Amino acid sequence: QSMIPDFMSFTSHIDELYESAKKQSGGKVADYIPQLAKFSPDLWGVSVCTVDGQRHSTGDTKVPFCLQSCVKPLKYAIAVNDLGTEYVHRYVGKEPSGLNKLFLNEDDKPHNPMVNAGAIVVTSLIKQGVNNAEKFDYVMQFLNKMAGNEYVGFSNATFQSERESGDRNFAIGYYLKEKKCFPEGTDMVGILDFYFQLCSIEVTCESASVMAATLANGGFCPITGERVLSPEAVRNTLSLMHSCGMYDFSGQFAFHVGLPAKSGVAGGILLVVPNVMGMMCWSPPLDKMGNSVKGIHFCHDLVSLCNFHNYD
Amino acid sequence: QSMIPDFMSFTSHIDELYESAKKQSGGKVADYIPQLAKFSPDLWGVSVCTVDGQRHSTGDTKVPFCLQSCVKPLKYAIAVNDLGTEYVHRYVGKEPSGLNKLFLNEDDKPHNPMVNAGAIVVTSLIKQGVNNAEKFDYVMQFLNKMAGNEYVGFSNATFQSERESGDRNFAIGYYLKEKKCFPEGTDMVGILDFYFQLCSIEVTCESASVMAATLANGGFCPITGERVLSPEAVRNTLSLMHSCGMYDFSGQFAFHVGLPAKSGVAGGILLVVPNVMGMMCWSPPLDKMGNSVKGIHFCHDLVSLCNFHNYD
Amino acid sequence: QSMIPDFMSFTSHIDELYESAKKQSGGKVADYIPQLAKFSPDLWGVSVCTVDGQRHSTGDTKVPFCLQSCVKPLKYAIAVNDLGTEYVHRYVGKEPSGLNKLFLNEDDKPHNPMVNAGAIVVTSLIKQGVNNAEKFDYVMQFLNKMAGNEYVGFSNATFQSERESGDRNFAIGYYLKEKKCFPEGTDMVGILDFYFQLCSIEVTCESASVMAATLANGGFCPITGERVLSPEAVRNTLSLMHSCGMYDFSGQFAFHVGLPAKSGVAGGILLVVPNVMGMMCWSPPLDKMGNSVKGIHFCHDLVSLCNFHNYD
Amino acid sequence: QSMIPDFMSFTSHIDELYESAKKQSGGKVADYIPQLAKFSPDLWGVSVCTVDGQRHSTGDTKVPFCLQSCVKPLKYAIAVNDLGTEYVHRYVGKEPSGLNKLFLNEDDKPHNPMVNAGAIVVTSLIKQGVNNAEKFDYVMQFLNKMAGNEYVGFSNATFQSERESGDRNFAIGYYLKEKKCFPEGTDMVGILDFYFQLCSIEVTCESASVMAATLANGGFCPITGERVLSPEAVRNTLSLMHSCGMYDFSGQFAFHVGLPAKSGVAGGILLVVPNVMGMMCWSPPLDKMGNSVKGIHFCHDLVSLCNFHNYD
């Protein structure tokens, strides 16, 4: 409950950590598509939004960037919220996979919602029946509520490039169709289209931190008081972000940082400190694992300083 | 050189083995598409064609059926014949894979030409540049020469069903595209189309046995004297049929039968006894491994009786 | 901080859950050795020990049983406590493995301290230099402090049976020696002996719950006020128990229960509710995964009722 | 039947190939034990022994060296010869494994007799009941018959070093014991001892080539006319040498050379040309795969020149 004693002083520490992370210039900006290669390796922003509704930003916190995989926890939350744990998990697993890297697990289901095959299946469960345009509007609405109506855009350029370039996602798409992993009567190619769109949704560190804070606040948006996601949805999302949100670094991350988080190839890291605050770190240069270098650094420092680790 | 002493007497033994195999009624006729489910489980034919040009058939040896995977050795032979060992193998491996069942190997190449991913890549190497209609005519011509101009048809029904149903081959198709496994400028979807057509080519035990005899005769068609395939092509094809031609039964088959062979889901088994004869066994009911039950039985008996095993 | 409002009332709920679990009669009592087969499938005990020092038991909470794998978290805590995170992890990983089931990971290290290969390596790090008798006394002392000097015995019968029967642990032992996984100059066979002894240490639900409470209390024994383990040791142990403490059920467990726990083939389940209490459930009949049936049931019920899940 | 036209001229070609291979100075002499590191990288010998009984040697063909893995085909032949295909294969598989590298396969049996786990199991089947000294004498006798009584020694130094250093073979030993892979009442540690001895048996290129010729001659020693191995034994051995005799190079070897062969860490390569001749190439420097560099080179050249490939 009693988060941080003095928020203003906490703010001062965020800035120090931010400054320290700024010195980390390693990594490479994703470049499989021009829309990602465009970004400057020097962009670096950190936005905080407590359960209180208190805000604080430092760095490039108003420059829009694509959620990419950061959207995975979000659409999963939405699915559980509208369909419940039981139904959703008839189509997707609940744990980290081994590491080469099969699309399905022992039961012919994607290992979890945080890997592509999983996110693709989860995408096929949301608002079934209506057209893609409607489904897309539906999720945008949902993301707006989580962000307390702050910035939520869309990158058509990214969407177009992701589609006419995601051969691997199509491989996954057909494979899942082959294994009957989708709900009866699913238009697979149409689902991949919806999936590419969701990955192309844009946010800023500021609006994203509010989304994170909503998850940190048991499903209530810290700046509107509104209930956006069901308790069940939030807990599931957090559990999976804890164990599968940082790609191949998930294990190390859970051990050293101990916080629910989710990274994206755009350089973002959606971080959550349960009952305390939500955060969004962003910096285009990624490491071998695919996580934002400055972001990973900052997260370690934050936990070592404020003792935020799940088991402190 | 000195094959079998008396061919007429050998013929009498073929009939006995054929009759013995006829008692084996186990297995299930493939049924993932209606064109295969249609077949009667009782169809059973065995055609022999020696290096001499001597023929002999017993059973349903004139009922057309699709080559399916039996065409894999054949198109591979063609590729090596027109492009040479070195070039072809820049795109496909030369050995059996482990067993779950990755599309690519350590070097991002399909393990060998006998598995789907391999056959698909091999298909992309033949007669590059021309349209599919032309490529198809080209291979048909080639198959005719191997069969000494005997029956070589095409099943449009099978082709159509294979296409609008091969989700797994499409998964493989996109995956290979993703890993840059095809030659520069390959139209992947167009290649899968050519691949489905090749699998739909029809033969009879009689015309197929002539094809096998051509491979048994170092590349010369036993009934026309013509050189159809280069020595290099024939040896490669035989080596791979020896180790990867019977799906997951390849190991057992190489150990107990010791002959170059290739099975197909239609129930066919293209068998080759180097410098002696070519054969084609056919019977729709397959076992767990996917091989023709009567066919597998007959092959074991043939080797136990005539001591045809590679190492006798 | 504010654990449960009224402990006496909480006690009443424990008894209800205990009674409910009692109806679950499935599973099989381990029987690879007679010392385990001896146990009655009806034994069922649950002991609670809060951070306050408040106690409560129900069922067979005074019948001694072997820790078996339950000792893994405990000796790991000890290693980190005396050697620090960095040193210990030069020899053992920090995450769940895939699932067949290799002894080592990508870096030739046991995946984590909760699997046999890991526990064996961890065992080789404790009190290096002294003889086994001394090492054993050292750990017993440590376990006594964690249990606030309550019951901590030893089963010579189990120890003897485990040794002259653990062919697989010996396979692991030699393999690790082969891969130079032990500290310079380690007597491998001697280490396996120490390992078998540690698995043979006996506790009761009551003394074990105190051990769990010590971990729940940041390293301080709830009934002596003494500092037994360093904060670093406790946090590491808890993180790994969260992700690797329930064998192949770890994933499901982390998702549905969300609590640090560790099971043992004797039927015990060391459970920990951070900053609230420690617990020890015990019931010999195990499920396919190897976890106590009644124990697994009880744990699910406890979290569904008291909302103890890490992310509630 | 009609091997090579003129043997004397063939001899002249062997010398040319031998000379050509001599220029290949790559590779590293095994050095996990001093008894192997001792060898000069320049040693290079090639001995030929036809089915006729005609001999020819070039290079260091009288310098003794350990069979090491070259003994695997030989003891397997012996097992099949005394127990028959059926019995032997209740304990060991018949095919190449995948590639990390599990000790057992799907049925809990070593994949084949050519890998360590397999050879160890095969070793436990020979002359059961008698003591190791007797078993050893028994196999020595057998090897003498295959070598037409030519050089067959023993390296006690190698044996001692292999034992007090084969941690991995012990891991395999205990693992197999754990999976009940040995015949009822097998003294596992005693079997590993017999296994280390068999690997320490010494031969020269000359005596080994005679052993190979015996296999090439359907089980009859070319220089004594005696029947040493049953036809069944020889065919099985050859089939497995064809597919599993060159470690991880087996696939490539079967494709490009197409001859039954078996390599050893001492630098030897037991080669067999069915119904023509037996050979033994030896040169201490091995490649990444573990095969003799000069040996591999020579074998390729031999087949390209004399068209000895199984499918020429």
UniProtKB/Swiss-Prot annotation, chains A, B, C, D:
Modification after translation (UniProt): Synthesized as a 74-kDa cytosolic precursor which is proteolytically processed by the mitochondrial-processing peptidase (MPP) via a 72-kDa intermediate to yield the mature mitochondrial 68- and 65-kDa subunits.
Organism domain of life: Eukaryota
Expression (tissue specificity): Isoform 1 and isoform 3 are detected in brain cortex. Isoform 3 is highly expressed in astrocytoma, ganglioglioma and ependymoma. Isoform 1 is highly expressed in brain and kidney, but not detected in liver. Isoform 3 is highly expressed in heart and pancreas, detected at lower levels in placenta, lung, pancreas and kidney, but is not detected in liver. Isoform 2 is expressed in cardiac and skeletal muscle.
Effect of L102A: Decreased enzyme activity
Residues that hold substrate according to the record: S69, N116, E162, N169, Y195, Y247, V265
Residues forming coiled coils: none
Effect ascribed to mutating L104A: Decreased enzyme activity
Modified residues (N6-acetyllysine): K94
Region of interest (Highly mobile activation loop), residue spans: 98-103
Domain notes: The C-terminal ANK repeats prevent the assembly of the supra-tetrameric filaments. A highly mobile activation loop at the dimer-dimer interface is important for enzyme activity.
Pathology noted in the entry: Developmental and epileptic encephalopathy 71: A form of epileptic encephalopathy, a heterogeneous group of severe early-onset epilepsies characterized by refractory seizures, neurodevelopmental impairment, and poor prognosis. Development is normal prior to seizure onset, after which cognitive and motor delays become apparent. DEE71 is an autosomal recessive form with onset at birth. Death occurs in first weeks of life. CASGID syndrome: An autosomal dominant disease characterized by infantile-onset cataract, erythematic subcutaneous nodules, profound developmental delay, self-injurious behavior, and intracerebral glutamate excess. Histopathologic analysis of skin lesions show deep perivascular and periglandular lymphohistiocytic infiltrates and pronounced leukocytoclasia at the surface of the dermis, focal vacuolar alterations, hyperkeratosis, and parakeratosis of the epidermis.
Subunit-level organization: Homotetramer, dimer of dimers. The tetramers can assemble into rod-like oligomers (in vitro), but the physiological significance of this is not clear. Interacts with RAF1 and MAP2K2. Interacts with ATCAY; the interaction is direct and may control GLS localization, negatively regulating its activity.
Function summary: Catalyzes the first reaction in the primary pathway for the renal catabolism of glutamine. Plays a role in maintaining acid-base homeostasis. Regulates the levels of the neurotransmitter glutamate, the main excitatory neurotransmitter in the brain.
Family statement drawn from the similarity comment of this UniProt entry: Belongs to the glutaminase family.
Name the UniProt record assigns to this protein: Glutaminase kidney isoform, mitochondrial
Species this chain originates from: Homo sapiens
Gene name of this polypeptide: GLS
Shown residues in whole-protein numbering: 221 to 531 of 669
